[PDB]
């Protein structure tokens, strides 16, 4: 059961790096004007993929 | 309103907070009440390393918008307390033209386009350099003379 | 104070020592101490085979510091003993306007922004040419023809 807990912690760290990467995806382009993902949402597809 | 927009909170004027296109900034050291109290019901995004909290302008300020640029000239620029000598990657004002409480004031150019936003200052005596955040063609960069303080 | 920032010890002037932008210079080819002792407490970095000296500036006087441009158009420039004829990639002057002990006269053009710092002289007669430090694409260089009489 604690091996189940440790793997649950491991995928919790996986969603942890996912959400830290998402906030760090927006840290270049929070609303920093120019308002453009030159290729980042097309390739990376981080979050809110409906911006031009 | 030449290009004039504000921020004030609980009996202390927190300087300015403006609109750049689709973006309403808030400098992250400013806390509290928006000058336009319909804007406080929108979710902000924190960038403590870049020192902002950004928000998406809705449609009802589309006629209320303002213009900016990405290019950078060299020289002198007007703002509300006076002039800024921007030389060598450094914005410099006369000493005392700023104060703590001048936070979130924009800088508009010799055309009217928003070129940077203030965050604080750093005194060099006869003038005072300016710690700011600008954009430089598809990114923001926090341009900061060291020893800065919250203005 | 045109651009007068000097190095002195015990009664003798050992040339100049200026704060240019980010830098306090000291000509390490000539011995001595500081002119004004408020910066005597600060650190210094010596060069061995190029013989300059550096210091990182405190901000409280940086408004008085000069500005640089690290490129070279031809013509005539300004310095402490008047004009200086810069042509052919080379700095020239008549004989006598610089004496041994004039180490560090800051060169600037017809609007006054710094381009070179003088070290020594040379001559085969009347036309003294000035061995200096130079910059190129914001990298330092040290330019000196052979047979230069050292200041």
């Amino acid at each position: 059961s604690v091996a189940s807990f440790v793997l649950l912690s491991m995928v919790g760290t996986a969603v942890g790096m996912c959400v830290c990467a998402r906030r760090r995806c927006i840290t270049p382009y929070e609303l920093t004007p120019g308002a453009t993902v030159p290729f980042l949402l097309s390739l990376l597809c981080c979050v809110r993929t409906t911006k031009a | 309103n030449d290009c004039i927009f504000e921020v004030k909170h609980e009996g202390k004027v927190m300087g300015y907070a403006c609109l750049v296109g689709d973006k309403v900034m808030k400098p992250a050291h400013v806390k509290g009440t928006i000058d336009n109290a319909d804007l406080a019901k929108l979710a902000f995004k924190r960038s403590s390393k870049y020192d902002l909290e950004c928000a998406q302008i809705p449609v009802h300020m589309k006629s209320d918008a303002s213009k900016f640029t990405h290019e950078k000239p060299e020289g002198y620029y007007n703002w509300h307390h006076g002039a800024v000598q921007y030389s060598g990657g450094r914005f410099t004002i006369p000493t005392g033209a700023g104060k703590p409480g001048d936070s979130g004031r924009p800088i508009f150019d010799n055309k009217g386009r928003v070129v940077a936003i203030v965050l604080g200052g750093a005194n060099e005596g006869a003038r005072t350099a300016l710690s700011v955040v600008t954009w430089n063609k598809d990114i923001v960069t926090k341009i900061t003379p060291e020893g800065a303080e919250e203005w």
Side-chain angles (χ1 to χ4, degrees), chain A, chain B:
Chain A
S1 200
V2 305
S4 88
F5 172 64
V6 163
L7 58 94
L8 165 58
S9 91
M10 192 255 277
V11 289
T13 66
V15 79
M17 57 86 88
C18 199
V19 68
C20 88
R22 185 162 318 171
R23 305 182 199 268
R24 289 299 192 203
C25 276
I26 205 67
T27 48
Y29 319 116
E30 294 88 323
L31 214 43
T32 71
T36 308
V37 274
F39 40 86
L40 302 96
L41 260 169
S42 47
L43 313 170
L44 154 64
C45 273
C46 208
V47 60
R48 286 159 178 96
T49 70
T50 44
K51 315 298 152 182
Chain B
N1 202 358
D2 201 46
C3 319
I4 309 166
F5 318 95
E6 210 52 51
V7 69
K8 184 253 180 198
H9 169 218
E10 65 184 3
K12 55 179 170 60
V13 181
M14 315 275 292
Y16 296 176
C18 293
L19 80 167
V20 180
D22 50 358
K23 161 189 170 53
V24 277
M25 86 292 287
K26 185 216 60 158
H29 62 271
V30 191
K31 340 280 185 189
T33 317
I34 177 78
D35 60 340
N36 220 336
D38 64 306
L39 272 302
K41 53 210 206 304
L42 202 150
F44 298 91
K45 182 89 63 176
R46 173 190 74 114
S47 78
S48 198
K49 184 173 170 302
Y50 265 124
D51 206 303
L52 274 312
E53 280 183 8
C54 303
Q56 264 206 340
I57 292 180
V59 303
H60 61 283
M61 313 307 203
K62 73 98 179 169
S63 274
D64 301 332
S66 57
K67 200 171 67 170
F68 78 108
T69 192
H70 262 301
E71 55 89 17
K72 291 292 207 297
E74 150 69 39
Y76 280 75
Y77 305 101
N78 182 33
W79 73 300
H80 164 255
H81 286 306
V84 172
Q85 175 197 23
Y86 163 71
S87 314
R90 184 180 323 275
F91 299 89
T92 52
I93 61 161
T95 309
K99 61 101 173 181
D102 280 1
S103 85
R105 289 172 162 265
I107 301 103
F108 77 110
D109 48 7
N110 43 1
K111 296 302 150 313
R113 300 188 277 174
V114 192
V115 290
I117 309 165
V118 79
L119 288 184
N123 178 34
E124 45 179 1
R127 287 185 75 90
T128 285
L130 208 66
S131 44
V132 287
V133 163
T134 176
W135 34 73
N136 39 333
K137 288 85 160 185
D138 88 352
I139 214 65
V140 287
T141 310
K142 179 184 277 166
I143 302 307
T144 291
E146 52 93 10
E149 76 267 345
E150 165 154 358
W151 265 13

